[PDB]
Every structure is written in C-alpha cells, then in structure tokens.
Symmetry: C2
C-alpha cells in the first residue's frame, strides 16, 4: 500500500532499519514493525529507528525540539534501553545534516542522551555516547552448561552479570559453547544479561553475551560497559579506559568515578525503498 | 575498496534472495562479496544472490545464449545450480521489469534450461509455475530425528530427499515437534539428504517441515515440496495428482504426472536500493 524510504545499518553488528519521518507522517504499527524486521519476509533487523522530533512522540517529556530515537524492537515493542542503537541514530543525524554540531542531544524513552561525533561520513562513523553512572550491585554467580562463574552484577538501566574469567584466553572464549544461563533468581527479579569476559590485557578484553530472552548476540552496548566495570574490579581499579572486543567489533569504554562513556563504530550500509 | 551495487530483496515462500541486476555483465562478483552481502547483520542478508545476466556471458553455460541466466550464488559464496523457489523470484523479476515479453519463457541455469509460466504478476507480487522434472523414487529408507524413527521415500529431484509421510500426524503436532539434525543411512544417501516430515494427504493437501543438508531447518524447500507431494500421493496409493503443500514460509501447489512435475507458488519483491560492500 505505501512505499517508504529507509536505510539499513548497524553498530557493531546490532542492525537496524532507519525510517525517516521528519514530518511524523508514519503510523508505524507493531505488526508493520514485525513484518519489516522479519529477516526472510522483510528486510531484517534487530529493530527500527524512526527519525522523528520528540514533540511528536506520544509520551516523550524531553525537550520537544530534540530528535527522538523512536526505537522499536523486532517484536514491535517500544525499546526502553537503546545502547549500540544510539551510535547509529547519531551517525544518521549528523551525516544527513539534521543536526549541525558534532556534539548534541538525542531524545530516547530512557531520557535524553548526549553524543559526540568523532569521525563521520555517509557510510561510517565513530561516536561517543554518555552511558550514565554504572550501578554496581555486587558479586553473584551463574551457571552456564554445568559450570559456575563468578560475576559482578551491574545495573546500566537493565541488569547484567559480568563474569571475568581469569585464565580464559580470547580463543578459549571463542570455543566455549554457551547456553541460557541459570543464576540467582532473587538477585535478578526481572532476569539478567550475562557476559563472559577475559581479563584486562593491554587495556583490552573480549566478551560474549547472552541477552535476556534473546540468547547470544553479536554486541550489547550496555553490556560492554558492564564488562568494563567488572574487568576493572577484577584488577582492583574502579576507574579506567577499556577496549572491549565483541563478536561484532570493538568498542572503547571509559569508566569515570562519576559516569561512563561508550565509543564505537556505526555503518550505514544500504539505502532504498520498501513496501507496506 | 568498497563498491556500491543496485539491488533488490525478495523472497519465494520466505526462501530469500538478493537480486543484483547485471545486464551488461560488468560486475565481477566474488565469493567473499557474496558472503558479505548475504550476512544478515553486517550486510543485507539472504539465502543467496541471483545475478541477472545473459547466458551468453556465463562461461560453461549449456543453454541458448539469448536466454537470461540465473547466476545463483549460495550465501557461503559457492556457485549453485537451481532453486525451486528462487526461479520463481527470478521469473518474477524478469517479467515485471520487462526483460522478457511473454508470460511463458525459459531461463538458463547451471542445471539446464527451466521453463516457467507467469500466472499473475505486478511489481511486488506474483504467482509462478516452474517445471521441476520427473521425480525418481530411489527406494525406501528411514531416519531418526531426535530419538524417533521415521520411514520414508527416497526421491531424487536433482538432489537427494527422504520424504517421510507420517500416518496420524496433525498440522498442530507437526508444528510442535522438536527437529534436530537427522541420522540416516549413509550407504543409501552417501552425499547427505534433505529430510521432509509430511502429513498424509487430506483434502488434497499436506503440511511439511524440512531439514536441508548442511543448513538445518528452512522455511521452504522447493524440491522438497515436490518430493513431499510424491510421497503423499504414494502413501494414498496414487501415482498422479495435484497437492497443496504448506511449509512454514507459505503454500505451494505441486502437480505430479508420469512424464514430469510442476511447482506453482508465490514470489515477492520487498525492497529496492543500493548497498555498499564494506
């Protein structure tokens, strides 16, 4: 029935359909989302980022003149957390001349985010995003596939449990076989994302992640910040700069005593039109 | 370098492809490019690439040079022959973009010429019939899926099949089975096999699920639907007929004769655009 312009891109292989809607002319229903993000029947993504002014988003109470990351999960749901996504949305905004400043603010359902474009062209960027104060909630354990791991619990807006594993190489991490983890039920009352991480080594670590009711993913933004907190803690530091390697790429995490940042890439890989 | 390529994304009963128009045979499309494009998160994502090129510009093409050739690449980069589903989408592309003038026409493939008939088409949707050859029932064998033994029929459609029609299987209970990679007779199927689990012919229809060799479960297998319909007819004591086959990605209609078979089914063209390879 309607043909609309779109783009496809990803931030460390967490991939999105960007749908411009400057004039908020699109009623994008949860069934339309689910269709569009169907990898075999549609275009295929982890979600849609619709480009709209905060003004026009039902329920945003942020400054109405911001651009708002109207972010939908692949199941249609209104995402309340955001991560890697922000890097892509920032990239689109800056490269299409929708903002004109390398440093600006983005309306999201989790509140305003602040970003800094560090490099940007039509296809690639590096973006620094302010991720909030990590809330460390303490030691916990989990079981994956008949093995206990010590982790550090971390709240970034959503819960994580980051298990830094002394001895474990990047290879051995690669070779482990993951399964839905079991963990402390009462410690995590809304479930938990679990990261397995190597130890700080040249200010870097490698991570794999099991997201909450999703399973293994290529990249989880909030998760890389969690892993960085843990890897620092596992070494006796509370502040620092860590390169985190996930299956989808590399980010850089900065842990301050009063905040955190995530720095990493974004890619706009295709442009076209799609039918409803 | 990077390279920007015009493309389309489509599917045939949710067996999905990237179509890449290359009428002047200018694009050198390598296996590593194919892999990158077909990557669902770093690329566009698909089961394969259909490059639209004249058979005159494919080396080793058996067919008439004036035909369009489906230069079909699998997602892993390897060259392929034919796809029951993908031919439907290719036919749809050629016809809806005016590259052929008739509703009935031939297409070149690496398995030889294929004859298609456009039943309905516009820019987004179509219904296409393809002639799929005489099935060759190679024998009776069995498999084991996740502990449970199924009896079936060897079918050679150009590639090996064990179509297992299961008396007393409802569609409900087919949808709830847990599929795992089957075990099979390695002597009967020395090159692997595609396994279809099928219900029994009822009101001229069956439902199927398929585990494709080296790929696991898919939403649709074109040659599988034809194997499935053979087995369904043979389990009903018939040698010929028309069967609607329901796969998780949609519905098709198989006609079996003594001297051949056809597969009719849908095609959709979902998007158009341009893509930059890394």
């Amino acid at each position: 029935n309607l043909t609309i312009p779109f783009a496809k891109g990803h931030a460390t292989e967490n991939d999105f359909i960007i749908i411009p809607d400057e004039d908020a002319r699109l009623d994008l229903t949860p069934e339309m989302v689910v269709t569009l993000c169907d990898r075999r029947a549609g275009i295929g993504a982890d979600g849609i980022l619709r480009v709209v002014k905060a003004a026009d988003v039902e329920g945003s109470t942020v400054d109405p003149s911001l651009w708002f990351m109207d972010y939908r999960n692949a199941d249609g749901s209104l995402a309340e957390m955001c991560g890697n996504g922000v890097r892509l949305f920032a990239h689109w905004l800056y490269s299409r001349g929708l903002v004109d400043n390398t440093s600006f603010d983005i309306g999201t359902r989790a509140g305003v985010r602040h970003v800094d474009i560090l490099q940007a062209d039509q296809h690639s960027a590096q973006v620094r995003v302010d991720m909030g104060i990590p809330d460390v909630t303490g030691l916990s354990t989990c079981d994956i596939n008949g093995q206990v791991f010590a982790g550090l619990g971390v709240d970034m807006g959503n819960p994580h449990l980051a298990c830094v594993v002394p001895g474990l190489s990047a290879s051995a991490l690669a070779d482990m076989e993951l399964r839905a983890p079991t963990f402390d039920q009462e410690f995590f009352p809304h479930g938990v994302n679990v990261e397995i991480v190597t130890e700080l080594e040249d200010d870097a670590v490698s991570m794999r992640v099991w997201e909450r009711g999703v399973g293994e993913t290529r990249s989880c933004g909030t998760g890389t910040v969690a892993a960085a907190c843990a890897a620092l803690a596992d070494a006796g530091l509370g502040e620092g700069t860590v390169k985190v390697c996930v299956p989808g790429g590399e980010v850089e995490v900065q842990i301050f005593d009063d905040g955190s940042t995530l720095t990493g890439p974004s890619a706009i890989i295709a442009l076209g039109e799609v039918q409803i």
